[PDB]
């Protein structure tokens, strides 16, 4: 029974919730377990990056996130092809590869290409035997580092470009932004019906002849 002003509120404790309460006394032991596991994998994959493979730069979907940039899942096939890395092989040198990524814009492609280029430059391929064949790097770049890379390999930093203080040309001052948006809105709204009226008018002009 409610009493004089409050939030008319609906708690969801009508099911047998105490049968399904999930406590969190694990979490410390969990965190430790995860960190132990993590340290094991690092030790197994000896001079490899603990991180895992190198992953692509990617824009977030939707108007909201839009401006940000993330790690993606793996490098697209078009990107690998441009870099000159055979798709089956890329996985063996520590390059993530999805083949589900389309590639719409050239701007995203080239930046990702640049990534793989950079990676190949700063990567130290050990030879299969200790007796060295082609590709495998020199024994100098080997002794100086069989080192792991702590943290994500070649990390992504969502970065901005500075603009120098301009002067504002008279034309720029002149721009009627708010108004411009409103117009554009209405043109989008009305584009379809305007087009229909035009089609009707053209039909009337042709109908006048016959």
């Amino acid at each position: 029974a409610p009493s004089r002003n409050g939030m008319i509120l609906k708690p969801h404790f009508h099911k047998d919730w105490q049968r399904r309460v999930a406590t969190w006394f694990n979490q410390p032991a969990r965190k430790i377990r995860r960190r132990k596991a993590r340290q094991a994998r690092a030790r197994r994959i000896a001079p490899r990056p603990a991180s895992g493979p190198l992953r692509p730069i990617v824009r977030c979907p939707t108007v909201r996130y839009h401006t940000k940039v993330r790690a993606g899942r793996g490098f697209s096939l078009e990107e690998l092809r441009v870099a000159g890395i055979h798709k089956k092989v890329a996985r063996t040198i520590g390059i993530s590869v999805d083949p589900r990524r389309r590639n719409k814009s050239t701007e995203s492609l080239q930046a990702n290409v640049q990534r793989l280029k950079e990676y190949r430059s700063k990567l130290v391929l050990f030879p299969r035997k200790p007796s060295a064949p082609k590709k495998g790097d020199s024994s100098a770049e080997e002794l100086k580092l069989a080192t792991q890379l702590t943290g994500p390999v070649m990390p992504i930093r969502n970065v901005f470009k500075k603009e120098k203080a301009r002067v504002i040309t008279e034309e720029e001052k002149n721009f009627k932004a708010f108004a411009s948006l409103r117009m554009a809105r209405a043109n989008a709204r009305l584009f379809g019906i305007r087009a229909k009226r035009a089609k009707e008018a053209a039909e009337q002009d042709v109908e006048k002849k016959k």
Binding site: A165, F175, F178, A179
Partner: protein, 147 residues
């Protein structure tokens, strides 16, 4: 702290602060928000006017990120930039006016509340209000739409 709670003081007293005429029975109203329309009607219709009944349009698969459009007022537009843009300007003597990309700092619309200081600015934003535009023009600046 049980130590600090009430029931410690009520030891001894029979009814335990619930009165002996009407008792602390189990559920005298009805459980929860029962009786909004009958018998708790007054409460609901002098502290929650508008609870009952439908209104407006349904909208089935709403997704909030489409309608994402955070706002910033002119009031504190210069707060976006480091003071030394606002300082190196009101100086300089070129009539330069620095750029304030609003979208970088996490706002899409530039609304019109507040006095802007007499000091030109190029403001890059996704949308503007009418008044917010007019103010910037009067300061001696330029609105810049951006996708």
């Amino acid at each position: 702290p049980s130590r600090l709670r009430k029931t410690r003081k009520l030891r001894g007293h029979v009814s335990h602060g619930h009165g002996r005429i009407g008792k602390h029975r189990k559920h005298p109203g009805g459980r929860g928000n029962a009786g909004g329309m009958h018998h708790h009607r007054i409460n609901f219709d002098k502290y929650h006017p508008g609870y009952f009944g439908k209104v407006g349009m349904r909208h089935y698969h709403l997704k909030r990120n489409q309608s994402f459009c955070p706002t910033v007022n002119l009031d504190k537009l210069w707060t976006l930039v480091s003071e030394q843009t606002r300082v190196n300007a009101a100086k300089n003597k070129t009539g330069a006016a620095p750029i304030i990309d609003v979208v970088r700092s996490g706002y899409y619309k530039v609304l019109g509340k507040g006095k802007l200081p007499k000091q030109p600015v190029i403001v890059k934003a996704k949308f503007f209000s009418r008044r917010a535009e007019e103010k910037i023009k009067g300061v001696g600046g330029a609105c810049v739409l951006v996708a």
